[PDB]
Amino acid sequence: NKCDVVVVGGGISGMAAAKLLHDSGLNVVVLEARDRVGGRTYTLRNQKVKYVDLGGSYVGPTQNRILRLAKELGLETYKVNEVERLIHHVKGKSYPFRGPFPPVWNPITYLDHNNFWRTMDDMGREIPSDAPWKAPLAEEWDNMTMKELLDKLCWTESAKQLATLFVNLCVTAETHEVSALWFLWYVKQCGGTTRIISTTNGGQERKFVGGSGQVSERIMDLLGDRVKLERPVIYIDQTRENVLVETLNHEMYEAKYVISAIPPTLGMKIHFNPPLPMMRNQMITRVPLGSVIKCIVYYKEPFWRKKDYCGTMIIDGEEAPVAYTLDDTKPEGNYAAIMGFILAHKARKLARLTKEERLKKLCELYAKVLGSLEALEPVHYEEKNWCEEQYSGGCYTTYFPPGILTQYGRVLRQPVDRIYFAGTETATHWSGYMEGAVEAGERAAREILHAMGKIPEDEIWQSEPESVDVPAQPITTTFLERHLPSVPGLLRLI
Amino acid sequence: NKCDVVVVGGGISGMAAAKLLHDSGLNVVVLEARDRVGGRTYTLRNQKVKYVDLGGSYVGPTQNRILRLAKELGLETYKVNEVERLIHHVKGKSYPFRGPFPPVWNPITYLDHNNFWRTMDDMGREIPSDAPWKAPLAEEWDNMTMKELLDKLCWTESAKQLATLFVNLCVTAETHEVSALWFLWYVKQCGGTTRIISTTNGGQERKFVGGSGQVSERIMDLLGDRVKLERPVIYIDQTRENVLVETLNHEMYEAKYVISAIPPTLGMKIHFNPPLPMMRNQMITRVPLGSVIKCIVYYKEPFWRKKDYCGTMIIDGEEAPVAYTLDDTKPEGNYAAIMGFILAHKARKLARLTKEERLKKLCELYAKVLGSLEALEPVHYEEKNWCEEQYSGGCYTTYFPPGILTQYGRVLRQPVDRIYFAGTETATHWSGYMEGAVEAGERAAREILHAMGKIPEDEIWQSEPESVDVPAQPITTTFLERHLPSVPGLLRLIGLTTI
Ligand SMILES: *[C]C1=C([C])[C]=C2C(=[C]1)N([C][C]([O])[C]([O])[C]([O])[C]OP([O])(=O)OP([O])(=O)O[C][C]1O[C](N3[C]=NC4=C3N=[C]N=C4[N])[C]([O])[C]1[O])C1=NC(=O)[N]C(=O)C1=N2[C]/[C]=[C]/N1[C][C][C](/[C]=[C]/C2=[C][C]=C(F)[C]=[C]2)[C][C]1
Ligand SMILES: *[C]C1=C([C])[C]=C2C(=[C]1)N([C][C]([O])[C]([O])[C]([O])[C]OP([O])(=O)OP([O])(=O)O[C][C]1O[C](N3[C]=NC4=C3N=[C]N=C4[N])[C]([O])[C]1[O])C1=NC(=O)[N]C(=O)C1=N2[C]/[C]=[C]/N1[C][C][C](/[C]=[C]/C2=[C][C]=C(F)[C]=[C]2)[C][C]1
């Protein structure tokens, strides 16, 4: 009934915000639509897998907020297996490699690949994390899809196919669907290309022991009966002294402040009185989430390691159902598994098949790529299609189509009276990740503390000391990588 | 509580559906979110204007369903004023003309203009009205914004600038926001470029006497108490034998079938049990409506007519708040008025101003365009920003960004168990218009009649006799229009001769 703050949504962001408010002595209620907490994180436990993350899972250096929160909740990390060689599968053949960037040998292709990565980061350096719409060339870059940019930039088919995979894999959408400005902001606000694509010393370095769902579950454990499961919010009324929040199951909650910790577009599921201001009213219709199926195939042993492969596979082309894989084996070396992502249009296409049909296709692919018949002998299979979720709308995060970020980007975390906005989409560092969810939850919480007089304005945004357990090493480039010409650069000279 | 069919939404589509169902003997209920029917049509009445349409207004030849419905409800139409000259305002100057297309004199620019319009229609003929995703190059065209298409197609800036205005004005969105396949489909399913842009012989030929809001009101009068105002639907449950529909004011309705007659994205406001299938679940997060303010400036007399201007202005430029106007003077010749549209990014930009600051900017623009100080002396002003409507989401209609129509398009009117989809967005002819609303509403109602075994399958889609009051002159082209070369095609003639 009556409380200080209603939080809408029990994902990591909402739970992080509720915890902060609780710890400062306010009465918080969390209204969660599902029969569980965690949102776009979900850890399934059964005897065959023990535990498996079917949503968000990876953390790495520079993600210091999710690591601090998780450590305080008593969680620990382990390292994703990258001891042996990575595989780039191109034109029906596997090429083993080391280091984060799939290498290339033809000298024109080399210049073209080097330039592509380098240009993503150069363009990034002119985009403010906290305001990408303030980039000098914001309108120019926002009025282009990533398909347009790649067509201009990539002089070789080899670079264009890897660039396309890069976009597909990072934001679960086609190059033609997404704004160039948004995608470049997105890479930049994760620390750039090397950081975003790296296992060792990057975003996929680590997983949580027991699964990432433990973050939300363990905060629910703290808050007790303050978390209301199967309470989808349908109605928020701000006309009176206190804010009134109504759920689908007819309950009414009364508060001084509200935090909306849901994906922007899922805002549409709530009827507002008074109506939302114009810009938010339209913004929440313009911000879809991507399309992905996360798939985990279990095997008797991690057989790929015997052939000096780590289990990472980068798989070019339209034919392959999965473009990217990591070893999902447990740190103890058991529950051997390969994790794969089915991305974008392939998620839509392959979801018509049965579970068994998807398993068969994945096993045949992995057999080809790893060059092993052992891949044809799976002991178990788990998957989750995030497209079918009424209360996610997809995964991993919200993408911005051409034109939207510059016109509506400002409104994303703009308070509407006593509603403040959280969720990973509103973060400025690792937005789209669990790290961003924490940053945005805590920030929105401190906005309400400031509105109440408890803290000064300069404490709303707070820095995070570096994790002692997951220290970040610097991103380095070489002289040649910095100064080698592009293909059109090499043409000018001749 | 109990009925045969709940219709969600009391716009033209919903009310047309309800009417057909009621006339066939079923018990129907219409649940409407607002305190009025009409949706994206809305006629304001006060003593200063008598009546004015702040939403959908114009009807024309080939729109035979809305004309037939309006006639059956006892409504009349009148012709929009196009007696005198149109104005094309470009780079700070006004160029009067006649006929639908702004003309050009420079021969190179002429070939480019002619080729732009012709290619729009050429690509359109490749695209099935009922299945745009079946066009041979559907994928190539849908992976492309209209901005990319115009950059490839227009060899002059003159043509590119006019083509940009054509997109902005027809779909209230920027060229970079919209799919090429979708836009080309949209134009084609209205009967092509000439039909869509024309006043005489086109979309903007006529208006209803007393306003277009009478269509929805008069159907409400036929239905009596079966229309429920201030019932926003929040929840649809299809787990049991009968469908349960719940409203925000805690009322429950029980029906055999539901027609959803709301814009696709406003489907997001409804919680579904069981959950929507994957494809529709994602589709309704991907289909926004455009941005527009409709503004009407009233004057003592229609002074433009005396300068031999009909009141139509096609206004190009970033500084212009309004890109298109029509004479909105009553047919009796009184309540002289200029109707204008503030489009796309300009609706957003200029919504920051007060009502009086917008009035001033409009008058100054009209003064310049018409060469008339009288334009600075308005007697009244009315406007409506459709962007702020919770239960519309924008106007005129839904646009599709790149990649969406080929991937999600086929689920737009695909039933979900016992929910059928109306709304103008689901039409195959004048989708986006009041015409499309009627087609979609009556088609969805008949899908239900078929499901109940009351009509055979071949009667779901029903053709419409031509209006005898508003006959359609066919779209014709001249020999030169058909065979004059593109700009690159002239350059190919030059390289082939001199070799
Ligand atoms: C799904 C997913 C997946 C599958 C995956 C992933 C993910 C996801 N991610 C993301 C995450 O998860 C996120 O971000 C988070 O979680 C979010 O949070 P928040 O914000 O909180 O939100 P959510 O969760 O959603 O929540 C919300 C809530 O609310 C609710 N609701 C609704 N509505 C409502 C409600 N309530 C009440 N009422 C109402 N009305 C709901 O229900 C919920 O609960 C992630 N993340 C991280 O961090 N990590 C990870 O891992 C993840 N994942 C992913 C990733 C992927 N990747 C990375 C990158 C890589 C790449 C690499 C490379 C490239 C290139 C080359 F060449 C190489 C390499 C891979 C991929
Ligand atoms: C808004 C608007 C405006 C401003 C204008 C316009 C329009 C609009 N349009 C459109 C119409 O209006 C539409 O389409 C219709 O109306 C639709 O219907 P429907 O489908 O039925 O839908 P609605 O209305 O929306 O309804 C719905 C309902 O529902 C409800 N809800 C929601 N949600 C809910 C509910 N309920 C319960 N629950 C829940 N949850 C609501 O409330 C409602 O009621 C139009 N149309 C027509 O036909 N006409 C017209 O006029 C119109 N408008 C416009 C036009 C424009 N334009 C045309 C074209 C031109 C061009 C020219 C040129 C170009 C170029 C050159 F060169 C030259 C020239 C322009 C203009």
In chain A, which residues are followed by a C-to-N distance beyond 2.5 Å, i.e. a gap? none
In the reported structure, the alpha carbon of residue B181 is separated from the centroid of ligand 2 by a whole-number distance in angstroms of 21
Residues of B whose CB is below 8 A from A345: 407
A409 to chain B, any CB pair closer than 8 A? The answer is no
Distances (CA, A) of B163 to B122, B233, B315: 15, 40, 12
CA distance A228 to A390: 18
Backbone angles phi, psi at A330, to 5 degrees: -70, 155
Q: Does B288 touch chain A (CB under 8 A)?
A: yes
Chain B residues within 8 A of A387 when measuring between CB atoms: 278-279, 281-282
Structure tokens at B313: 């202005």
CA distances from B253 to B16, B233, B244, B250 (A): 20, 10, 6, 10
What are the boundaries of each domain within chain B?
1-39+61-76+209-287+401-461, 40-60+77-105+198-208+288-400, 106-197
CA distance B191 to A219: 59
Query: Cα(A51)–Cα(B232) distance, rounded to whole angstroms?
Result: 42
Length of chain B: 499
Q: Would the CB of B88 count as within 6 Å of ligand 2?
A: no
Look up residue B59 and give its DSSP letter: B
Could you give the CA distance from residue B64 to residue B463 in angstroms, rounded to a whole number?
Answer: 10
Q: What is the CA radius of gyration of chain B?
A: 23
How deeply is B398 buried, as exposed, middle or buried, from its count of CB atoms within 10 A (0-12, 13-18, 19+)? buried
Q: From the CA of B387, how many Å to the nearest CA of chain A?
A: 6
Q: Give contacts of A 117-176 with B, CB under 8 A.
A: 142-145, 147-148, 174, 176
CATH number of B1-39+61-76+209-287+401-461: 3.50.50.60
Cβ neighbours, 10 Å, residue B368: 17
Sign, CA dihedral B445-B451-B455-B458, equals positive
CA distance A409 to A400: 9
Q: Which of A174, A288, A402 shows the shortest C-beta gap to B282?
A: A288
CATH 3.90.660.10 for domain A40-60+77-105+198-208+288-400, yes or no, is yes
Which of B320, B262, B351 minimizes the C-alpha distance to A280? B351
β partners of residue B293: B342, B385
Backbone angles phi, psi at B435, to 5 degrees: -55, -55
Distance of CA B381 from the midpoint of ligand 2 (Å): 21
Decide whether any atom of ligand 2 lies within 6 Å of the B187 Cβ: no
Instruction: State both tokens at A363.
Output: 């096993």
Which tokens go with A437?
């969810």
Integer angstrom CA distances of residue A302 from A276, A305, A310:
53, 6, 9
Q: Helix (H, G, I), strand (E, B), or coil: what is residue A28?
A: strand
Residue of the CA atom closest to atom 6 of ligand 2 = B56
Cβ-proximal residues to A25 (8 Å cutoff; 6+ apart), any chain: none
Number of Cβ within a 10 Å radius of residue B333: 11
Q: Which residues fall within 8 angstroms of residue A290, CB to CB, at 6 or more apart?
A: A171, A172, A173, A344, A394, A395, A396, A397, A399
A474 CA → ligand 2 middle, Å: 55
Locate the ligand 1 atom nearest the alpha carbon of residue A234 and give its number: 40
Nearest protein Cα to ligand 2, atom 28: B9
Both tokens of A421, joined, read 């906005």
| Nearest C-alpha neighbor of A206 from the set A429, A382, A475, A467 | A467
> 10 Å Cβ neighbour count for B27?
13
The pairing of beta strand A271-273 with beta strand A233-237 = parallel
Q: Which helix (H) or strand (E) holds A109?
A: helix A107-124
DSSP helix/strand/coil, A243: strand
B127 CB near ligand 2 (under 6 Å): no
Superfamily in which the A106-197 domain is placed by CATH: Guanine Nucleotide Dissociation Inhibitor, domain 1 (1.10.405.10)
Enter the tokens of residue B135: 């066009």
The answer to whether the CB of A175 falls within 8 A of the CB of A164 is yes
| Residues B119-140 as b or e (16 or more Cβ within 10 Å = b) | bbbebbebbeeeebbebeebbe
Distance of CA B361 to the CA centre of its chain: 26
What residue owns the CA closest to ligand 2's atom 59?
B170
Contacts of B271 in chain A (CB under 8 A): 232, 234, 248, 269, 390
**3 state SS of A486:** coil
d(CA B378, CA B362): 10
Burial of A68 (0-12, 13-18, 19+ CB in 10 A): middle
- Do residues B291 and B173 lie in contact, with contact meaning Cβ atoms separated by under 8 Å? yes
B282 has a chain A CB within 8 A of its CB: yes
The CA distance from B319 to B316, in Å, is 9
Nearest CA to ligand 1 atom 52: A56
The resolution in Å comes to 2.3
> Touching check for B403 and chain A: CB below 8 Å?
yes
Q: Which atom of ligand 2 is nearest to the CA of B324?
A: 70
- What SS3 state is found at B468? coil
Residue type, position B197, single letter: I
Q: Which residues of A touch B291 (CB under 8 A)?
A: 282
CA-CA distance, A360 to A465, in Å (whole number)?
Answer: 46
- In terms of Cα–Cα distance, which of A250, A253, A230 is closest to A391? A230
Which ligand number lies closest to the CA of residue A198? Answer: 1
The two structure tokens encoding residue B43: 């006629």
> Any chain A CB within 8 A of the CB of B383?
no
8 A C-beta contact, residue B498 and residue B88: no
Q: How close A227 gets to chain B, by Cα (Å)?
A: 21
Neighbouring-strand partners of residue A52: A44
Q: Is the dihedral of CA B124, B125, B126, B128 positive or negative?
A: positive
Phi, psi (rounded to 5 degrees) for B217: -60, -45
Q: Is the Cβ atom of B11 under 6 angstroms away from ligand 2?
A: yes
Residues 233-252 of A with CB under 8 A from B: 234-235, 248, 250
- Dihedrals phi, psi of A391, to nearest 5 degrees: -110, 15
DSSP B30-52: EE-SSSSS-TT--EE--TTTS-E
